[PDB]
Amino acid sequence: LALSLTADQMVSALLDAEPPILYSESMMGLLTNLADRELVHMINWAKRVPGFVDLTLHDQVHLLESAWLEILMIGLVWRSMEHPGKLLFAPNLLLDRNQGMVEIFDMLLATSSRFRMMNLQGEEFVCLKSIILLNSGVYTFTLKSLEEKDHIHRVLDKITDTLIHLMAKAGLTLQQQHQRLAQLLLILSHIRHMSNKGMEHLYSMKSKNVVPSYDLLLEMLDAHRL
Amino acid sequence: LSLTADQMVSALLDAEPPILYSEYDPTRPFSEASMMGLLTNLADRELVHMINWAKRVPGFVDLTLHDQVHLLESAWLEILMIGLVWRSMEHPGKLLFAPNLLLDRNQGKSVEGMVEIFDMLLATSSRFRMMNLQGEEFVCLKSIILLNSGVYTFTLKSLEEKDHIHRVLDKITDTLIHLMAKAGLTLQQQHQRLAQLLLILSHIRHMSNKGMEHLYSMKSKVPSYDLLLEMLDAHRLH
Ligand SMILES: CNCCOc1ccc([C@@H]2c3ccc(O)cc3CC3(CC3)N2C(=O)c2ccccc2)cc1
Ligand SMILES: CNCCOc1ccc([C@@H]2c3ccc(O)cc3CC3(CC3)N2C(=O)c2ccccc2)cc1
Prior knowledge:
By secondary structure, chain A is mostly helical.
């Protein structure tokens, strides 16, 4: 029944689901602590993305495993759009590139500058986040699994429809619509690249719970009791 | 920037590199021990053609040589992989590295970390199959990889280059949409398919980063920036 929402309904649901902005509480201890607290809010947000909770819990966890760092990154880029040259990790934690860290830092700044140049809108941003959640694990998962992937692709199609709808209501021509859609989805591959480097770094720590476990994510999802 | 969509597709089709073979060296028969050497030599020969292909992607040679090399340094493995996936599309469960080098997953299990990447490639091939990806779409996607993968990791000249690259990417988008419009897809089907194709590029980037990790774990003597520049920096004496 999530696949029966109108585009306007999809947008409203996604705007209403947005997580709060957290505050920060060693720069790296601070950033780890912030990320760890944001994760919980991200899960609550994921559960409100239309179509997401129709998946099995097992598949919801896999999608969160694959997507969470990309989702933290795109949130950071969004918060940082109005702060050229700086990254707004939290309202009390604005860092510039002077504060292997600088490479990712510079890439995030470039992404934030690209969003600024494009005049990325909030309604577009929340569609892009939902695409990351559904797309980032869809290629790295039986009859049941195939049905799940099929559902994922149907939801992704509806989000594409919603993005085009937003662009059309903003007065873009059909050409500008498809050009903008393409520009936004190409940025997602850069966001994937940044996440890949950060995940490589986390795994290299060989430290039990630095990468959120399946069990931790599952606990956060707070499964029904029946 | 002046080309029509039809002329863009024709240029990209005309620029396509050939399908290369693995060596037929009777002194070097295929085995698990020789496999990496055969695959490295194949990749090395493909890279030479890839350089000459890139120079034929409309808009690419308008860039500085320095920026051309950066784009190739950032894209070459993705381009090698998407070509592999394309060659494998019609062979479920196999990777067609060359017509005489068709491997299955159990042959992948020879090396550490190789089967994981192998399965990601197979999944991409399966997705191409499900979408019934067309050759004209494939050549558009490969050019997008070339222009997009390095554009976010690059002065007034740099601003002009990035503007140019974004204009060329926009023309390839127009070209992809035109291919689907000519075929008869509805507008809704056109936007849905464009998005489906472009989302696959995130997966290809992911695979490229895993593959880079794997190649570096080989501890052999990856094309360097200096090496790619030597290859792209052609003279005009021919
Ligand atoms: C999950 N438990 C284990 C910790 O994983 C962590 C996850 C994220 C981060 C932060 C963080 C925090 C909040 C945010 O909203 C976004 C980010 C982004 C990020 C990865 C880019 N990061 C950094 O520090 C960073 C690194 C190098 C260059 C610039 C920034 C820290 C640790
Ligand atoms: C570039 N200079 C030095 C060469 O580095 C090389 C570049 C490419 C490869 C092959 C190769 C060859 C041709 C092709 O078209 C594609 C590929 C794909 C690939 C990169 C993923 N590869 C592997 O073996 C591999 C590994 C794990 C899983 C599956 C495949 C070997 C070495």
